[PDB]
Amino acid sequence: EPSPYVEFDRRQWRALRMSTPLALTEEELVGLRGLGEQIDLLEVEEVYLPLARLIHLQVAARQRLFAATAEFLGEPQQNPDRPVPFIIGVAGSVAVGKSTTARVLQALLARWDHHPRVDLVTTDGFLYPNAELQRRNLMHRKGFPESYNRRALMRFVTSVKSGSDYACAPVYSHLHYDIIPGAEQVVRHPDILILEGLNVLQTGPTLMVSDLFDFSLYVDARIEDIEQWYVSRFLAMRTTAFADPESHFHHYAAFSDSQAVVAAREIWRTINRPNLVENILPTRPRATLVLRKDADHSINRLRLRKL
Amino acid sequence: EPSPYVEFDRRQWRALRMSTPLALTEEELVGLRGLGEQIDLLEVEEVYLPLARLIHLQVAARQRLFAATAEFLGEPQQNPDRPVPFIIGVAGSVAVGKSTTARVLQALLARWDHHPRVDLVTTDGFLYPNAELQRRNLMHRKGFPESYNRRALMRFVTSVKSGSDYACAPVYSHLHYDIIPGAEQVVRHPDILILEGLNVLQTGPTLMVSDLFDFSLYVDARIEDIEQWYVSRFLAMRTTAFADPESHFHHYAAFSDSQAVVAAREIWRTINRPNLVENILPTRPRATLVLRKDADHSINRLRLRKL
Ligand SMILES: Nc1ncnc2c1ncn2[C@@H]1O[C@H](COP(=O)(O)OP(=O)(O)OP(=O)(O)O)[C@@H](O)[C@H]1O
Ligand SMILES: Nc1ncnc2c1ncn2[C@@H]1O[C@H](COP(=O)(O)OP(=O)(O)OP(=O)(O)O)[C@@H](O)[C@H]1O
Ligand code: NA
Ligand code: NA
């Protein structure tokens, strides 16, 4: 029976790469790869290149849609070379790899003919300050929809896509586990804006950023695996981030593999997992493209929305 | 501050009509107008013509989007003259005029160059049978999301848009207040499919028909007015539909203006109003175009989604 989707195995997907050129060194893929991630240039070749090709085919097509409305509205023509920014959403669970997926994607798309301004904005900075979360009894729901200033987030994307000269987003510090005072990321009329976060794909009683997306990615994996990835990465961070005396979680550095595992699982059980199940996963159905990962972080399956 | 929307007054909207021809007689508008509706050829000129123009501009544009994905997928070209059907959703409250709005729209779009097959499907037929509603304790929630076989509805639209040769939908009888046994509406690869219902625009934890829409209309009016329209129409039906001895509500024909008013308001209070507030109105934010009506049924304002 008919389906809005079309699935592929990596062999199948690899072939749609067609002629697409690989413009990234292995030293560059590294500065994009997050701790624990297994992405290599091969995967970028058989998976991210076709995806970049697809996206570019749609970037031009997606604008005929706006032009039409512009033609209808009698309005003049586009603004000869400052089009409606193509907005891309990247969603997925904590520790699934989306952050890397988002960075690799921005790199590939920026290295394109004529060289388009491709900005990447994570929703981290749209989290409420710890003081504000403390006030709303939310310090233990960081990552849940309500922990974000979803209104500010919407004003931001709406602004950039509505053709603004520049827009600002706050900045979150992963070292201090909090929003950075006075800091800001400025975005100037990009050609493509990539928005990455746990729920970007959420719908609601109001127009949300998921409604402004022209294309969307959802990095997926078996829930047991992600937990394994989360915990492993947690243990792994004892000698990297947590090692730093400035880290809000420096006390974790001294944990034993054993107590660190216990600590990691508890956080996952009480926070990240509930949010994945209750909020993130239910948005997967409408992702333009879903990247399914095997326990080894390898992307070997894909589901595309043809409808 | 930027907005995804752009509003118009009828004067403003009237002008976007541009050159669009009026191909409907006043005798034809009548066979489309529902009891209580005040729509006339003037309104069709200053409101429905621009709208038809807009939609046609998008019908071609919207397909460059599919072609792109087809080009990417290596797939051959479209099927030379049986394109991806353009799906249009029309939503709104009971008694707001959408049913008429939907019929007038189908008429206008069918009377177009090359003459496209424009089918209209109301979600009435996707309601569960009274026996089935009785079983789910839903006979008093007819119109609410749960009273519809939303899965069958999705299979239907998915099927038509996925390029099916033909698809079937059940048929609802307004005379018998129930689904008609063995009846079916067959839709054959339309060029445009109009889907009209109370909630068509609903989103959820799963891919829904709102997600397959290429354009959407939401007929709006002040809630107090709609109630007035509902009640008036209810009274008015004592000498038309209810007069028929076959009517499931024939007993209403004998009501006095007074007890009929009481009866009408109760139904509105307990069913239609709650559903408008809790389910329909919350979907308005994402309608491509909203037709705002003044107490006299006159459309004098419009809100278009430019984003
Ligand atoms: N305490 C931390 N210090 C630094 N980085 C952290 C910390 N916790 C999580 N991270 C994340 O590690 C990410 C890079 O790895 P990856 O790209 O695999 O992240 P992820 O899977 O999206 O996980 P997360 O949602 O925690 O970022 C950075 O984007 C950063 O947000
Ligand atoms: N008992 C009834 N008998 C016949 N038609 C009815 C009855 N109740 C409501 N209607 C509706 O009257 C509609 C035509 O008028 P209009 O186009 O104004 O309807 P509407 O505002 O959408 O109201 P409704 O949702 O009740 O159809 C028909 O589509 C039919 O569904
Ligand atoms: Na910028
Ligand atoms: Na047909």
Side-chain angles (χ1 to χ4, degrees), chain A residues 124-130 170-173 176-181:
Chain A
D124 281 335
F126 284 99
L127 278 167
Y128 282 122
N130 290 332
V171 182
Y172 181 76
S173 172
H176 291 98
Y177 192 56
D178 201 355
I179 292 297
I180 299 158

Side-chain angles (χ1 to χ4, degrees), chain A residues 35-38 93-97 221-237 257 260-262 264-269 272-273 276 293-297:
Chain A
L35 197 57
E37 283 298 276
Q38 309 298 308
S93 173
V94 151
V96 75
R222 194 162 169 277
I223 202 169
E224 299 70 20
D225 302 322
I226 306 170
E227 181 195 311
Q228 182 49 53
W229 298 345
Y230 174 80
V231 164
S232 178
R233 177 156 137 300
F234 185 99
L235 258 60
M237 298 196 75
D257 298 31
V261 164
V262 170
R265 286 173 169 171
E266 244 304 288
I267 307 185
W268 173 267
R269 185 186 81 76
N272 304 311
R273 191 173 184 295
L276 168 51
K293 283 177 182 175
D294 290 311
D296 53 30
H297 295 77

Side-chain angles (χ1 to χ4, degrees), chain B residues 91-152:
Chain B
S93 173
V94 151
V96 75
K98 51 164 169 52
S99 292
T100 297
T101 287
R103 290 186 295 261
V104 173
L105 182 42
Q106 173 199 43
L108 297 183
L109 302 171
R111 281 162 157 65
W112 205 278
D113 307 296
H114 314 302
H115 294 289
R117 180 177 279 166
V118 188
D119 284 317
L120 162 48
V121 171
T122 61
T123 50
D124 281 335
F126 284 99
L127 278 167
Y128 282 122
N130 290 332
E132 180 55 5
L133 295 170
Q134 272 152 30
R135 189 186 72 82
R136 313 192 175 203
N137 287 314
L138 290 180
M139 278 307 287
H140 57 295
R141 307 268 296 177
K142 213 150 174 184
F144 284 74
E146 61 260 41
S147 70
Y148 294 83
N149 191 317
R150 286 174 290 176
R151 202 180 42 178

Side-chain angles (χ1 to χ4, degrees), chain B residues 32 34-35 37 93-100 103 124 174-175 196 198 233 237 241-242 249:
Chain B
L32 294 183
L35 197 57
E37 283 298 276
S93 173
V94 151
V96 75
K98 51 164 169 52
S99 292
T100 297
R103 290 186 295 261
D124 281 335
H174 274 286
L175 178 71
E196 184 256 301
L198 298 171
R233 177 156 137 300
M237 298 196 75
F242 303 155
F249 303 112

Side-chain angles (χ1 to χ4, degrees), chain A residues 53 58 64 69 72 204 286, chain B residues 53 58 69 72 204 286:
Chain A
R53 176 190 168 220
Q58 308 224 311
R64 299 228 150 232
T69 304
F72 164 73
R286 80 178 64 86
Chain B
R53 176 190 168 220
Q58 308 224 311
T69 304
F72 164 73
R286 80 178 64 86

Side-chain angles (χ1 to χ4, degrees), chain A residues 1-6 8 13 16-18 50-51 53-55 57-58 61-62 64-66 68-69 71-74 84 154-155 157-159 161-164 203-207 211-212 281-283 285-286 304-307, chain B residues 1-6 8 13 16-18 50-51 53-55 57-58 61-62 64-66 68-69 71-74 84 154-155 157-159 161-164 203-207 211-212 281-283 285-286 304-307:
Chain A
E1 78 174 59
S3 179
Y5 316 116
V6 48
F8 308 68
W13 184 265
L16 298 173
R17 172 190 176 178
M18 284 320 149
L51 170 54
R53 176 190 168 220
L54 168 49
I55 291 185
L57 287 180
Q58 308 224 311
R62 189 67 180 199
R64 299 228 150 232
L65 197 168
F66 297 88
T69 304
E71 173 180 346
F72 164 73
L73 289 184
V84 186
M154 185 56 192
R155 285 191 296 275
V157 185
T158 297
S159 172
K161 182 154 183 173
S162 81
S164 294
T203 22
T206 183
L207 205 52
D211 292 279
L212 297 183
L281 263 169
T283 62
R286 80 178 64 86
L304 175 68
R305 270 190 59 185
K306 62 187 195 66
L307 280 189
Chain B
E1 78 174 59
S3 179
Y5 316 116
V6 48
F8 308 68
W13 184 265
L16 298 173
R17 172 190 176 178
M18 284 320 149
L51 170 54
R53 176 190 168 220
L54 168 49
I55 291 185
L57 287 179
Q58 308 224 311
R62 189 67 180 199
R64 299 228 150 232
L65 197 168
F66 297 88
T69 304
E71 173 180 346
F72 164 73
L73 289 184
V84 186
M154 185 56 192
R155 285 191 296 275
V157 185
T158 297
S159 172
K161 182 154 183 173
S162 81
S164 294
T203 22
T206 183
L207 205 52
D211 292 279
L212 297 183
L281 263 169
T283 62
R286 80 178 64 86
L304 175 68
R305 270 190 59 185
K306 62 187 195 66
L307 280 189

Side-chain angles (χ1 to χ4, degrees), chain A residues 15-80 82-304:
Chain A
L16 298 173
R17 172 190 176 178
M18 284 320 149
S19 60
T20 306
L22 171 50
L24 198 74
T25 71
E26 185 145 65
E27 182 194 293
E28 295 179 307
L29 176 56
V30 154
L32 294 183
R33 185 186 338 183
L35 197 57
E37 283 298 276
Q38 309 298 308
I39 192 181
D40 54 32
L41 290 172
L42 177 56
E43 192 178 73
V44 179
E45 278 188 348
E46 314 191 315
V47 180
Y48 289 74
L49 292 177
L51 170 54
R53 176 190 168 220
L54 168 49
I55 291 185
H56 270 90
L57 287 180
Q58 308 224 311
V59 181
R62 189 67 180 199
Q63 201 174 351
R64 299 228 150 232
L65 197 168
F66 297 88
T69 304
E71 173 180 346
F72 164 73
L73 289 184
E75 273 181 354
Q77 210 140 162
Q78 76 212 303
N79 280 289
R82 236 173 88 164
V84 186
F86 188 92
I87 310 305
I88 311 184
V90 174
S93 173
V94 151
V96 75
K98 51 164 169 52
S99 292
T100 297
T101 287
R103 290 186 295 261
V104 173
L105 182 42
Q106 173 199 43
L108 297 183
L109 302 171
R111 281 162 157 65
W112 205 278
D113 307 296
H114 314 302
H115 294 289
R117 180 177 279 166
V118 188
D119 284 317
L120 162 48
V121 171
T122 61
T123 50
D124 281 335
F126 284 99
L127 278 167
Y128 282 122
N130 290 332
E132 180 55 5
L133 295 170
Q134 272 152 30
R135 189 186 72 82
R136 313 192 175 203
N137 286 314
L138 290 180
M139 278 307 287
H140 57 295
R141 307 268 296 177
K142 213 150 174 184
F144 284 74
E146 61 260 41
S147 70
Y148 294 83
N149 191 317
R150 286 174 290 176
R151 202 180 42 178
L153 170 60
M154 185 56 192
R155 285 191 296 275
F156 177 72
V157 185
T158 297
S159 172
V160 167
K161 182 154 183 173
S162 81
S164 294
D165 287 36
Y166 67 103
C168 314
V171 182
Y172 181 76
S173 172
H174 274 286
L175 178 71
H176 291 98
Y177 192 56
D178 201 355
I179 292 297
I180 299 158
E184 50 177 41
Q185 186 185 332
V186 176
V187 171
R188 275 135 183 152
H189 51 273
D191 288 293
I192 294 177
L193 174 54
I194 298 184
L195 189 58
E196 184 256 301
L198 298 171
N199 357 211
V200 305
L201 288 178
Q202 289 205 316
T203 22
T206 183
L207 205 52
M208 297 170 89
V209 300
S210 67
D211 292 279
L212 297 183
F213 291 164
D214 300 311
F215 189 94
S216 67
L217 269 169
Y218 175 107
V219 185
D220 187 58
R222 194 162 169 277
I223 202 169
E224 299 70 20
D225 302 322
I226 306 170
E227 181 195 311
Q228 182 49 53
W229 298 345
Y230 174 80
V231 164
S232 178
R233 177 156 137 300
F234 185 99
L235 258 60
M237 298 196 75
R238 286 177 300 176
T239 48
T240 66
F242 303 155
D244 191 319
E246 292 296 317
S247 180
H248 193 63
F249 303 112
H250 180 50
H251 58 286
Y252 284 149
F255 281 36
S256 60
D257 298 31
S258 188
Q259 43 194 301
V261 164
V262 170
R265 286 173 169 171
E266 244 304 288
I267 307 185
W268 173 267
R269 185 186 81 76
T270 69
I271 306 177
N272 304 311
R273 191 173 184 295
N275 180 47
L276 168 51
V277 168
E278 293 158 40
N279 299 298
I280 307 178
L281 263 169
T283 62
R284 189 178 56 176
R286 80 178 64 86
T288 323
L289 185 59
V290 170
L291 310 181
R292 298 178 186 286
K293 283 177 182 175
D294 290 311
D296 53 30
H297 295 77
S298 176
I299 296 175
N300 285 304
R301 275 170 284 181
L302 304 82
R303 190 201 77 190
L304 175 68

